[PDB]
UniProtKB/Swiss-Prot annotation, chains A, B:
Cellular location(s): Cytoplasm
GO cellular component, one term: cytoplasm
Gene name tied to this protein: dtxR
Record InterPro entries: DtxR/IdeR_SH3 (IPR040767), DtxR_MntR_Metal-Reg (IPR050536), Fe_dep_repressor (IPR001367), Fe_dep_repressor_sf (IPR036421), FeoA_core_dom (IPR038157), HTH_DTXR (IPR022687), Iron_dep_repressor (IPR022689), Transcriptional_repressor_C (IPR008988)
Species assigned in the record: Corynebacterium diphtheriae (strain PW8)
Lineage: Bacteria, Bacillati, Actinomycetota, Actinomycetes, Mycobacteriales
Protein name listed in UniProt: Diphtheria toxin repressor
Length: 212, 212
């Protein structure tokens, strides 16, 4: 699958960098047991998506976008391994190869929950530290994207980017601020709290970021 | 992915049967949000693999092979859901749609381990009973296929299918029988126990079935 392939490629480039290897195409080809031509094809596709840039010396430099994605795949891999050894107790000799697949199906919601249920997510069972925890959020998701009712917590209001200041007090009345558990629902978006019902507007809807 | 697609189709046919619906192509198309033509294509491919037979009334009858596979996917789905609600504690409104992907990456080894770690695997969180536990083995794997050293347990010897009776006593000496924890290793296959080292031959290697 194209997506899964790219994710696998990005993770590979990440690993090599972490191991100290120069991410050269032939190295990635070897590690992924893919042929040079095949990887050139895939790498040539990643470039078109602004995911990687083949440096002047044929080394693959991950663009910020590609690295952000590569990181998320490492986090989903690592957490899968933590889950597999710690909870499931899968043979340590199977844990990694299995994780190589789980990283493509594990959602951020599951990841966040694993950060909860697991005793220690500092490193993977293989001693490689777990990246992207800050990015995972364990800032926040914008209400417009995160909002059926549900009770999240206000991570940020971002009143500073506001042009419309009418609902500032409407928020202050209901007592909605940073850390305020509130119940949202896209219908427009209305976030209730203190029995109060604050129906938001587009601008605030796009700037108020909440956590799960 | 072709395999994942077929697995998804087989599980769908299983579900419908379980719900009491007649597995008709248009029903599968609808449930999978696939088009009639696309499903006809995939179903036409499953036939070539002896996985399904389009009955005289256009209803898809799963061949024993297809059903055996369909079942394994239901087990891997169900156990994924049990894992997700019971251990991870994922929002029950996400559990199923997530599981629809996990069932394609979860291995029998993981399944067996989940049958261990989970409190109750009688039914899925959705009340549908978990099929294929007997087939999962929680008879056994043939030593030739299951055998680095590892200490499994003899599920069956199948001396009855033996033409060569030379190692019967060689086994009885080492005290290798049903329930005998032994250490195997393909080098040929040698299963040690009681300090004894019993190097097996092809015939017994293919008939002695052990569990993990
Ligand atoms: Zn790994
Ligand atoms: Zn389900």
């Amino acid at each position: 699958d194209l997506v899964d392939t790219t994710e696998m490629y990005l993770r590979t480039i990440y690993e090599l960098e972490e191991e100290g290897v120069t991410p050269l195409r032939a190295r990635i080809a070897e590690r992924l047991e893919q042929s040079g031509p095949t990887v050139s094809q895939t790498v040539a596709r990643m470039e078109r998506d602004g995911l990687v840039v083949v440096a002047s010396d044929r080394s693959l430099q991950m663009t910020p976008t590609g690295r952000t994605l590569a990181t998320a795949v490492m986090r989903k891999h690592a957490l899968a391994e933590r889950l597999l050894t710690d909870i499931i107790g899968l043979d340590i000799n199977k844990v990694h190869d299995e994780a190589c697949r789980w990283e493509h199906v594990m959602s951020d919601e599951v990841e966040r929950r694993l950060v909860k249920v697991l005793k220690d997510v500092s490193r993977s069972p293989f001693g490689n530290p777990i990246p992207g925890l800050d990015e995972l959020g364990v800032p926040g998701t914008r209400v417009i994207d995160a909002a059926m009712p549900r009770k999240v917590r206000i991570v940020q209001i971002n009143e500073i980017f506001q042009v419309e200041t009418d609902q500032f007090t409407q928020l202050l009345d209901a007592d909605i601020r940073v850390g305020s558990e509130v119940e949202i629902v896209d219908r427009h978006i209305t976030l209730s709290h203190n029995g109060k019902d604050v129906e938001l507007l587009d601008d605030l809807a796009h700037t108020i970021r909440i956590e799960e």
